[PDB]
Each structure stands twice: as C-alpha cells, then as structure tokens.
C-alpha cells in the first residue's frame, strides 16, 4: 500500500490511468509469464532478452491484462509494482536501514498477498544495498523467492544476465528465464500499428499504414545497433518529431521515414528525387569529371549503385564487390575516390585499408579485431569499427596483390554473407558497403592481356574468392590520345589549389602534348605523370 | 532540480547571461528533433572536447526564451547537471542514490525539466559498479519511456568505451554529432562573442584579430579543438591588455600564442 508507493510505482494503477502504451502481440510471452507466476514454488519469471525488444513492455502488457481481467483468476486483482531499488538504497547511510526498508516491503507483500513485485534490471539486485558489512538484497529475497511466497518478475539483458545472475548461481535458481525474443518484422508492423495512436497524439501527425510497414522493414534491413521492437519506433518518432519541428496535418509516409533513416546511418534509402534520379542515370557520365577513358568500370560501378538505389540489390550481399585489375596508374584508386565523391562529396570518405602493410597473418588483426585474452581486444579492428559507424561506405582494399594469402579469406565471409564478426564479439554489416579490391598487374613469340591477368588473379587469389566477387574489371591501359584529356584535369583542380592571381595556366596551347609525353611510359602509370605536371608548370610558377 | 547541483540555463538565458551562439543552428534543430520524441527523447551530444556542446545547449536554452520551441519544448526549464557533483561526497551507502532520487523526484513534481548532464562516461559506474546501483541503472527506466529528458555530452571515445560497450544504453541515448567547426564558422562564433569580450575586458577587438585566431590556433596548437582554442586567444589578449593598462589586434593575440607554445620569439 503506502509502503510500496514510496519505494516503487504501481503498474496496475498506471494501466488504469492509461499511462502504459498498448502491447500488441506478446500474447504467448505474457502467457508464459502468467504460467510462471501461477507456480507454487519459484513463481518468479525473468524476461531475458536483447536490449530493447520490449522486456519491460511485456510487464506493461501484464499490468493492463490485470485491469482488463485477461489474466487467470490466480492473478486477478494483482498489484504489479516496479520495485525501485534505488529508492531502497536511498537514505540508507547507516547499518540496517536498507535491510529495514526491504523487510518493510516484504512485510507489506505478505500482508496483502496480491503483489507481483516487478524488479526491472534484476542484475542490479546482486549488490543492492551491499556495503562493508551489509546484507545484499539478493540474500534477503532468496528465502522468499525459493518458497514461492514472493511473486517477482525480473527483466534483464542477456549480456547483463551472464555478468550478474549467472555469476550468482544461487539466484539464477530462484528465477525462470522467460526468453523475450527479438520479434519478426511482421510482428513489429503489428506493434507499430498498435502504437499508431500514441504517436499520432504526441507528434500531432497522421502516420499511414505504409509508413509502419516501411519503418519495420527499413530498420531491420538498415540499422544494426539496436533490436526490432524499438529501432522501428525510433524511425516513427524522428519522423513525427521532425514534423513538430519544421511546422513549429502532414502525413508521415515512406518518404518521411526514409529521410530520417538517411540522416541516421548515412545510408541513402530515399524514395528517389527526380534530380537524384537523373544524376544516377548519368552517374557514368558524372564520374567522367574525375577519371576518363575507362568506359567499362565506370559503367560497371554505375550499374551496381543504380542496382542499390533501385532496391534490387541482394539484401544479404554487399552493394557491390569489385576487383580493380589492370596495370598501375590507370585510375584504380582515382575511381574509388571518384566513387566516394559521388556518394559523399569527399574523396577521403572511403576507408582505405592498405593491404601492402599486411604480408603475413601474424599482424592481420587490424581488420577483424583481436581474440579474447590478447591485446587489442577492447579496440578490436580498424575495418569493422569504421564500417559499423558508416554502414554505407565505399571501402578500398588498396594493393591486395602485396597482401597475405590468408587475409582475404577473413574477407571471404564479407563478400557472400555481408557480415564480419570482430574479435570483440560483434557482427558488423557490410551489406551496404561497396567493397573494392585494387590490384596492380606480350612476352614471347605470337602473331598479332585480358586472359593472362585472369589467370594471374587465379594464381594470386583462390578461385573461391573470385567466385564471390560480383564484378572483376580488368582496366584498359591509357591511350596517348586520352593523356591529352588527362592533363586537362590537372590544370583545372590541381591548379585550383593555386591562388587566382598566382597563376594563369589554362593557356590552350599545343605544349600540353609535350606535357602529355613527359612523365609517362608504357610501364609507368599516370602517377609518374601527375607529379611532372605539379613540379614543372604549377609549383614553380607559384613561388615568385 | 535544485540549484545546488546545477543551474537553470533557461533562467540564465532569460536574464541574458549565456553566451550568444552564432552558428550551430542546425545542431540545435537536431537536439530539438530528438527532444520532441515521445520515447527515448535523450540527445547525447557527441563531439570533441570544447567544440561547443554546451554552446549548443546554451543556444537551446535561449531558444526556449526566444520561442523557437516545437510546442513540446515550450516553457521547459533546462537545469544543467554535473553528474560528478552528485558523486562527490559519497563514501557511505545511499549518498549518491539519495541525491539522485531527490533530483529525479524534483522532475516528476515540477514537470518541465530538461537535464543537461555532461560526462556520460561517468554515468556508467557512477556508483560502485553496474551490479551495484549506479546512475546508469536509476535513469534507465525513465529514459526509455520519455518521462525524463536528458541531453548528453560525450567525446566520441567515451561514447565508444562506455555507452557502445554498455548493452541497453545505446538505445536510450540518441546520438547527435556536434562536429568540429571550420575556420569560417569559428570566425562567425567570434563575431557573435565579441560584444561580450569587448564589454568584459573593456577593450576593442579588431576584425583582424579573429581571422588570425582562427588560423594560428589550427596552425600551431594540436592537443585541443578550435571553437575553444580560438576563443581563448581573444580572451587572454583582452586580459593581458587589461593587465598592462586599449585595442586588441593580430599583434595583441600574437604574443598570447607565444606564451604557451615553445616559441622564444
């Protein structure tokens, strides 16, 4: 009664007042709770579950099942209290104040007998009121919970069920683990449709049925740090909270949640703008403003991104897995920097894992983390920890030919399944990344490659890695005609690093054909060529 | 929330004691977008130390007075809260928890409180441990129901080490990335603050001082961020002018930079 009201909140009285949101679904889970609560001994369930799957929502479904009377008669007219363990530790400076407050709770529960004492965060019970010489609240409740003279629901994260309830193996016996699972997407749509009126009333927006269908499928496909019955409400809220913001009714639609999810992970999931659609159809031409003369790769990386933006990509494979073969200097990294520029506006927005820094496996732990017990376990992996922050991210495995024979086998799981578990124990998704594998690659008597370079990738890579690469693109060597076009790119933006009184270099002369000649060989690339443009016409016309 | 463990930033913004915030108008909208949510309305401000994360909230506390609210943030007082000040003075049981349950009792009774807690790496382990009762166990039931609006502030590493490693704390604080400002954005910060620094030091800060303070601070100082290492240069130069006494220019902020870094002349 009055003792329980000052140490906790009545959830049954909160369900009479309508303060608990509707719990649509979870009928078989609340039935499992009421099954455990109707036992004679050890009538104590624990809603173990992933964080955010609605563990405390199942009990809110129970508190409004008592008010509706949908409980069995053994649980009819029960008063379900969220026991605030901080309220019991509060004002317990002296010895025996906490143990007095906990026995005063239990004396009221034995008196009334209609109390189900929901202890949210049951891992906090081990060590609750534990001082130098005190009795923790576990050891006071253990005779109560074992005899079934105290009905108590727990709610614990599965991570927090190992560390504090399985490290107290006596207390684990007193409870029953009711596995509250991560629901399916169709169950989450019914959760969202049942919560339609609560978020219509607070955000003052109508939320359509397709928006509920989107925010369950969009969250499951494109968000991995949370769980379904929460990361779907999360997209419904910041939809409607933006409409309270920008209007200071407007319906929440598929476009209103996809623009939230685009501002959430950085993954463009939009119902596409016509201006965005035009630059995707001419993506192969708008990547011709940084690289020229490929015409097979710049088309085939444009096919993979349009396949992603039209939603026709395999939702368990990456957005595009490529090998950029060919001779050196033909625009391999310069296409990946162009591909990152189209998708982000930043050339350093890609994740360049230099595979030349790896040659063995005994340093290969910076891309999938260190295993437990070994150093580098709490900051495990530099590839994974940058991809779970940018799930849409072109990553660039530059110079894979200088790497180990058993480091791309770690990435062999990334190409098909789109995942990679780091050493920490956490699965990161590569399903939305664009994987790039840059590789630097006739002899004798023949009547007059593409064939030998496939054989030399078959020598270097296993044919099981090439099996999982979506597009293998051998690059064509730069013709002397298009080196005329290549030097025109340097006199514009690398001469745009220059200040526009310190230069006048767009001359339109015929001496650029001499600049096209100096710095290029049939064995060299255009890098020994981009250096000669800087140090001969740009950087020495600037120091005066 | 008492004025013992923090202060009312909206009552300070009504009296005009907070810094004028020029820039960060897009970040304040993202904080209002997270604060206007029915559940999980808890924006953690992820940014490098001293990029203006309080200056987001000081500008947000002004926007309560200026009326830029989404009508769910209307007439909401915003008490800042030092989470470590509740920790300070706790050697015995129920010292931290009593002072934390008091300040949460004064939110349910008052009913318009938006806590700004800094140092959310202190939140995990504010008490003895996680199995013990800490502030990362008391706040969490009310941070999932939207009955408690707390604005956070981590670095990015503190967010990775203490919140992303904490199960069931990632889902309760929603990330708002306060970025590192550019050099022109930093000058516009200094153009708005100059009515405070010229009226406090009783000097005149020229326009040439601020274009140098946004350039020399990036050029010479790398252990600390811009929207603070540039504010500091025109702060100490006004104090050095008050001490030597008046006009601050790119020569008055000059020797202030030479005081710290190992530059003989």
């Amino acid at each position: 009664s009055l003792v329980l009201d000052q140490f906790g909140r009545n959830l049954t009285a909160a369900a009479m007042e309508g303060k608990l949101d509707p719990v649509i679904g979870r009928e078989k889970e609340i039935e499992r709770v009421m099954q455990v609560l109707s036992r004679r001994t050890k009538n104590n369930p624990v809603l173990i579950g992933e964080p955010g799957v609605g563990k405390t929502a199942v009990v809110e479904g129970l508190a409004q099942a008592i008010v509706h009377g949908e409980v069995p008669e053994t649980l009819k007219d029960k008063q379900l209290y969220t026991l605030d363990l901080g309220s019991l530790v509060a004002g317990s400076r002296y010895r025996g104040d906490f143990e007095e407050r906990l026995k005063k709770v239990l004396k009221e529960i034995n008196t009334r007998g209609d109390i189900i004492l929901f202890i949210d965060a049951l891992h906090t019970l081990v060590g609750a009121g534990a001082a130098e010489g005190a009795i923790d609240a576990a050891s006071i409740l253990k005779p109560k919970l074992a005899r079934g003279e105290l009905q108590t629901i727990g709610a614990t994260t599965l991570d927090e069920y190992r560390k504090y309830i399985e490290k107290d193996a006596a207390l684990e016996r007193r409870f029953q683990p009711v596995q509250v699972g991560e629901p399916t997407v169709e169950h989450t749509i019914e959760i969202l449709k049942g919560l339609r009126d609560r978020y219509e009333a607070h955000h003052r927006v109508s939320i359509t049925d397709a928006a509920m269908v989107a925010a369950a499928t969009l969250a499951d496909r494109y968000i991995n740090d949370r769980f379904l019955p929460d990361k779907a409400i999360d997209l419904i809220d910041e939809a409607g909270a933006r409409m309270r913001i920008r209007r200071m009714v407007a319906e929440v639609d598929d476009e209103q949640i996809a623009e939230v999810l685009g501002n959430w992970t950085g993954i463009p999931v939009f119902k596409l703008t016509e201006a965005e659609t035009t630059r995707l159809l001419r993506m192969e031409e708008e990547l011709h403003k940084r690289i020229i003369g490929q015409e097979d790769a710049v088309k085939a990386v444009s096919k993979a991104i349009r396949r992603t933006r039209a939603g026709l990509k395999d939702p368990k494979r990456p957005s595009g897995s490529f090998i950029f073969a060919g001779p050196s200097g033909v625009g391999k990294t310069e296409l990946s920097k162009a591909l990152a520029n189209f998708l982000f506006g930043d050339d350093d927005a890609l994740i360049q894992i230099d595979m030349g820094e790896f040659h063995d496996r005994f340093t290969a732990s910076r891309l999938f983390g260190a295993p437990p017990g070994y150093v580098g376990y709490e900051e495990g992996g530099q590839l994974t920890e940058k991809v779970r922050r940018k799930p849409f991210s072109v990553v660039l495995f530059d110079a894979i030919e200088k790497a180990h024979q058993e480091i791309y086998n770690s990435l062999l799981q990334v190409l098909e399944d789109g995942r990679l578990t780091d050493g920490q124990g956490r699965t990161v998704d590569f399903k939305n990344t664009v994987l790039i594998f840059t590789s630097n690659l006739g002899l004798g008597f023949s009547k007059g490659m593409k064939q030998k370079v496939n054989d030399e990738l078959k020598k270097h890579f296993r044919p099981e890695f090439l099996n999982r690469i979506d597009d293998i693109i051998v690059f064509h060597q730069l013709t002397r005609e298009e080196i005329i076009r290549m030097v025109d790119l340097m006199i514009s933006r690398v001469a745009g690093q220059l200040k526009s009184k310190d230069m006048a270099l767009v001359l339109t002369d015929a001496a650029k054909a001499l600049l096209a000649k100096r710095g290029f060989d049939p064995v060299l690339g255009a890098r020994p060529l981009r250096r000669t443009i800087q140090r001969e016409i740009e950087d020495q016309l600037s120091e005066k | 929330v008492l004025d013992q463990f923090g202060r009312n930033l909206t009552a300070a913004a009504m009296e005009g004691k907070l810094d004028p915030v020029i820039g960060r108008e897009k970040e304040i909208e993202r904080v209002m977008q997270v604060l206007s949510r029915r559940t999980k309305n808890n924006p953690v401000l992820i940014g490098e130390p001293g990029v203006g994360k309080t200056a987001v909230v000081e500008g947000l506390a002004q926007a309560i007075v200026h009326g830029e609210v989404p009508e769910t943030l209307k007439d909401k007082q915003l008490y800042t809260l030092d989470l470590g000040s509740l920790v300070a003075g706790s050697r015995y049981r129920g010292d931290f928890e009593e002072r934390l349950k008091k300040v949460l009792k004064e939110i349910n009774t008052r009913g318009d409180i938006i806590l700004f807690i800094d140092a959310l790496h202190t939140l995990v382990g504010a008490g003895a441990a996680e199995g013990a009762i800490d502030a990362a166990s008391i706040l969490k039931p009310k941070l999932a129901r939207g009955e408690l609006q707390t604005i956070g502030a981590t670095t990015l590493d503190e967010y990775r080490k203490y919140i992303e490693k904490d199960a069931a704390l990632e889902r309760r604080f929603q990330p708002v990335q306060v970025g590192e400002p550019t050099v022109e954005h930093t000058i516009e910060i200094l153009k708005g603050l100059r009515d405070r620094y010229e009226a406090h030091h009783r000097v005149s800060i020229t326009d040439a001082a601020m274009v140098a303070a946004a350039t020399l601070a990036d050029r010479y100082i790398n252990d600390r961020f811009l929207p603070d290492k540039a504010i500091d240069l025109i702060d100490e130069a006004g104090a050095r002018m008050r001490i030597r006494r008046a006009e601050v220019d790119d020569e008055q902020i000059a020797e202030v930079l030479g005081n710290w870094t190992g530059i003989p002349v």
């Binding site: 400076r93 534990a130 017990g373 070994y374 150093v375 | 015995y92 049981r93 129920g94």
Partner: peptide, 24 residues
C-alpha cells in the same frame, strides 16, 4: 601477435554502512 592482455582486476571500491553514535 600472442601478446596477452593481462586483465588486472582492481579490488572493490565499495560503499560502507554505518554504526551511529546515539545522542539526544
């Protein structure tokens, strides 16, 4: 590579309850 991490667990910094001295 096979450099072990050495957990190095601290002793428990914990609270203390109180016997109190009675006064009028």
């Amino acid at each position: 590579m096979k450099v072990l991490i050495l957990a190095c667990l601290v002793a428990l910094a914990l609270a203390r309850e109180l016997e109190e001295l009675n006064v009028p």
